[PDB]
Protein backbone atom coordinates (compact mmCIF):
# COMPACT_ATOMS: atom_id res chain seq x y z
CA UNK A 1 0.00 0.00 0.00
CA UNK A 2 1.11 3.53 0.88
CA UNK A 3 4.78 2.97 1.76
CA UNK A 4 5.71 5.93 3.95
CA UNK A 5 9.10 6.74 5.42
CA UNK A 6 10.01 7.60 9.01
CA UNK A 7 9.31 11.34 8.80
CA UNK A 8 5.75 10.72 7.51
CA UNK A 9 5.30 8.36 10.48
CA UNK A 10 6.41 11.10 12.89
CA UNK A 11 4.07 13.57 11.17
CA UNK A 12 1.14 11.13 11.36
CA UNK A 13 1.80 10.48 15.06
CA UNK A 14 1.96 14.20 15.81
CA UNK A 15 -1.22 14.79 13.80
CA UNK A 16 -3.03 12.08 15.77
CA UNK A 17 -1.81 13.67 19.01
CA UNK A 18 -3.06 17.06 17.83
CA UNK A 19 -6.36 15.47 16.78
CA UNK A 20 -6.89 14.07 20.28
CA UNK A 21 -5.94 17.44 21.79
CA UNK A 22 -8.42 19.18 19.48
CA UNK A 23 -11.10 16.68 20.49
CA UNK A 24 -10.46 17.51 24.14
CA UNK A 25 -10.53 21.26 23.45
CA UNK A 26 -13.72 21.02 21.39
CA UNK A 27 -15.37 18.99 24.14
CA UNK A 28 -14.36 21.57 26.73
CA UNK A 29 -15.71 24.44 24.64
CA UNK A 30 -18.99 22.73 23.72
CA UNK A 31 -19.76 21.39 27.22
CA UNK A 32 -18.81 24.58 29.07
Amino acid sequence: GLKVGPVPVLVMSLLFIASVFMLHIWGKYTRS
Binding site: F21, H24, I25, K28
Partner: protein, 61 residues
Protein backbone atom coordinates in the same frame (compact mmCIF):
# COMPACT_ATOMS: atom_id res chain seq x y z
CA UNK B 1 16.03 -40.15 43.89
CA UNK B 2 16.09 -36.47 42.95
CA UNK B 3 19.17 -35.67 45.07
CA UNK B 4 21.61 -37.10 42.51
CA UNK B 5 20.26 -35.02 39.57
CA UNK B 6 20.46 -31.92 41.78
CA UNK B 7 24.06 -32.67 42.76
CA UNK B 8 24.96 -33.29 39.11
CA UNK B 9 23.34 -29.99 38.13
CA UNK B 10 25.22 -28.16 40.88
CA UNK B 11 28.54 -29.67 39.79
CA UNK B 12 27.90 -28.81 36.14
CA UNK B 13 26.92 -25.25 37.05
CA UNK B 14 30.05 -24.85 39.18
CA UNK B 15 32.25 -26.06 36.32
CA UNK B 16 30.45 -23.77 33.86
CA UNK B 17 30.84 -20.70 36.09
CA UNK B 18 34.49 -21.43 36.80
CA UNK B 19 35.03 -21.81 33.05
CA UNK B 20 32.95 -18.81 31.95
CA UNK B 21 34.73 -15.58 31.01
CA UNK B 22 33.83 -13.08 33.72
CA UNK B 23 34.03 -9.35 32.93
CA UNK B 24 37.11 -7.45 34.06
CA UNK B 25 37.07 -3.89 35.42
CA UNK B 26 37.32 -2.40 31.92
CA UNK B 27 34.52 -4.52 30.43
CA UNK B 28 32.33 -3.96 33.49
CA UNK B 29 33.02 -0.22 33.39
CA UNK B 30 32.09 -0.06 29.70
CA UNK B 31 28.89 -2.08 30.15
CA UNK B 32 27.91 -0.04 33.21
CA UNK B 33 28.47 3.20 31.30
CA UNK B 34 26.41 2.00 28.34
CA UNK B 35 23.56 0.76 30.53
CA UNK B 36 23.59 3.98 32.56
CA UNK B 37 23.48 6.05 29.36
CA UNK B 38 20.57 4.04 27.96
CA UNK B 39 18.69 4.16 31.26
CA UNK B 40 19.29 7.90 31.52
CA UNK B 41 18.04 8.46 27.97
CA UNK B 42 14.84 6.45 28.34
CA UNK B 43 14.01 7.36 31.94
CA UNK B 44 14.77 11.07 31.70
CA UNK B 45 12.93 11.46 28.39
CA UNK B 46 9.95 9.76 30.03
CA UNK B 47 10.25 11.88 33.18
CA UNK B 48 10.40 15.14 31.23
CA UNK B 49 7.53 14.12 28.93
CA UNK B 50 5.38 13.31 31.96
CA UNK B 51 6.37 16.54 33.71
CA UNK B 52 5.48 18.62 30.63
CA UNK B 53 2.21 16.78 30.13
CA UNK B 54 0.97 17.12 33.72
CA UNK B 55 0.01 20.82 33.27
CA UNK B 56 -1.10 20.16 29.69
CA UNK B 57 -3.41 17.36 30.81
CA UNK B 58 -4.64 19.68 33.55
CA UNK B 59 -5.43 22.39 30.99
CA UNK B 60 -7.20 20.14 28.47
CA UNK B 61 -8.98 18.10 31.16
Amino acid sequence: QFVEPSRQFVKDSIRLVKRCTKPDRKEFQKIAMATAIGFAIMGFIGFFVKLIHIPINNIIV
